[PDB]
């Protein structure tokens, strides 16, 4: 169990089995990316493989933006959805999860993409909106049908936010 | 006229007055980012402030994506509207735009957006797709009530692209 | 209240509200960057605009450079100016403020720069020095007349500095 | 054909289809990374996945550096190998060959690697060193068994190479 | 002779010998930052160290910036002397130097700086204003007592500044 | 004494006097880079002067790499010299180190190399695997005849590694 602090976002949270961190300037502004390595280890000191078609995005969600957290993750979901697959298609095996983590509570909305490409990997999302009893965190997992969202540690990760104090 | 190179993608074009380069990596892989500078000038050799709502981003589009000019340019136009104005709205003021770029061809797409949210400026979004007549380059201006797109100048723009040779 | 911690420089500090970490290269060395975000929040995990106009720089003031609290935050406040606002112009508007960071003591020096230039907006700078009764750290927080320095958000700043141990 | 000139190198090349460039401050002081583009095309504007176990360096050899050419092909392949397969293993598979880029004449050493870790995947490396007839430039493609060197493409890159006049 | 354009500031110039480029974002509007090779050549594909305490930087120097060309230099070197030498000193050692670059006219002034540290080595700055018989080019050569300003490269640097047609 | 926590690589370790972090996405993927600071200090804020041939790195060592830590170290310390010293040369003045960090055991390699090329500085690596008694670290320390290997504060390094809880 790896915990890692967000000063700038007021959290920490558990990083993932087989995640690292990329993009550090995340944490600048209160977030954190994170990707899945693979291949073999790297030469020591230097950084990983990571996949190209699956992320973790998770951070502080703005008080001004999004309003219950079931209503919260859903449209989050349908505009990380348009953010990161643009591209046509429909929704199938939508799920909406509930979230608690130590007492704060939340909601996640999952979906998967059928593109009308027919080339294309179908998408998946994961996107969890979770608060304080008002301090609020999301977490966004992208996948595809080769690299897809892992629903159980998904939640894990949400559900291991803890606000700083 | 400032003519810009752009070796990787295999197309030079002129650079819009009052827009600079951003991001260079870009060039690597064949497109170019342009920002529009506000304010005053910096101080000498320093970089400008650039606005933060409106963006061009243009480039050669692989032979795989998208098949007319005229639907490439709708299709591609869609795709840009998810990825860089995610959240939900309606489309209103839309326009196609007949693009020749000293013989090769193409097509032009635009449209407006207006938020559900009340409180977000309008989106606007321009996107050109022309070819020779099989090579293909996009151009994709992005702005705002704030700072909207100037179709005369994102036309020059689309038709002021010539293939290097 | 977000404290945070920078421990190459060996202190911590409280976050301004409204500010956000820039160029995190600089904690590697022991100092940090924040800038001012401005307009609405930026999509969930992408970085907020900010304020061009107006910085705040902090950090472990070398045992070598600059000699009580006072003169060295006039010293500091001179050879700032000149760094930051490098253009010909008259100080007016100079303050001095005592600080008290929780038993250690330091001094900041204010001025307004109104410049020979008559299109240029008047600028502002607030350098601080404090330090335990010998490790010592500055606090600079420059703005304009349109992003004026916050001066009692300054002192707030300075004496929230602790020492990390 | 794409013709990218490297003016601090002084020389141009021909980019080898299926490659871009990646870290562009190699151009800064006269070379070249260039990467293998894998699976579909990216959004339009944005970077291609690449592969990670293959790369291709270019650059203009520093006159103190290495000595003839196929002495110094020899020696630069050798000290690439150490550079970019640091682990034990032995060398099988060797080959030397002569380069002609119109008229400036030069030398490649190709070999493999066998790594001790059976699980490695053999490692491959293609050294070229090109001179007028003294400006000199070398060509290093690393490769492994899942991606290999592609020795013609090699020898073309390398007398692709141009002075720059 | 090592030619470079500069395409966005509309310019070419010739690199000086013994500089390599820095931080080629610098070109994306219209700059250039050169650096001064110290030392061994590096591994080959590799950056070279540069020195410390001596740098150039040149670029278009906006129409709406200082006006003769005499008067033009005057000021800029003042104020790049507060930007890249803040600390306190006196000006001694001045010099005007008349610049002709090919029929563009232009003027440079040059000072060395005795710092009121007396560990500080003393600083040297020559800066320069050319234009077409109105677009204008800036260049500025920082150096030290350790790695003096070049007086006369500093010259042919500016003197072989062409605009881009 | 300076502590830095490495939170995705699961430790902590005292920053050597006198070296500061350097390319701190090291930290993403649970290593570090440091590098020793050269010459009088920077301008507050800035970043210092850092020598150009020596440096730490320090970092989780993957679990699948390298098996006793006398042999880990031995092992990494050849890779290690390959990878940083990729040229001719043959070891000289090895020594073996075994290292006690608080309880967690483990052993360094040094060696100097002698180059061929009688122009180059000799080589000095410093390789040292230690280990709870299963996660184990790395901590190698670059250096030449002009910045030597700090042997005793290398073992300090070392032995001031400790878990994070």
Redesign the interface.
Known sequence: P????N??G?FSFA?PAGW????????????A?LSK?????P???????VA?DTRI???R??Q??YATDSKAAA??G??????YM???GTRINQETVSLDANGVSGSASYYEVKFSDP??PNGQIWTGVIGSPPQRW?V?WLGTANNPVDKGAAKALAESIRPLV
């Open positions: 790896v915990r890692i602090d000063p700038v007021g990083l690292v961190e990329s993009d550090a300037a995340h944490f600048d502004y209160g977030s990316l390595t693979t291949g073999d280890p030469f020591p000191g230097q950084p990983p493989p190209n995005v998770l951070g969600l703005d001004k933006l449209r989050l349908s505009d990380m959805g348009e953010f643009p591209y046509p080339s294309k999301f966004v």
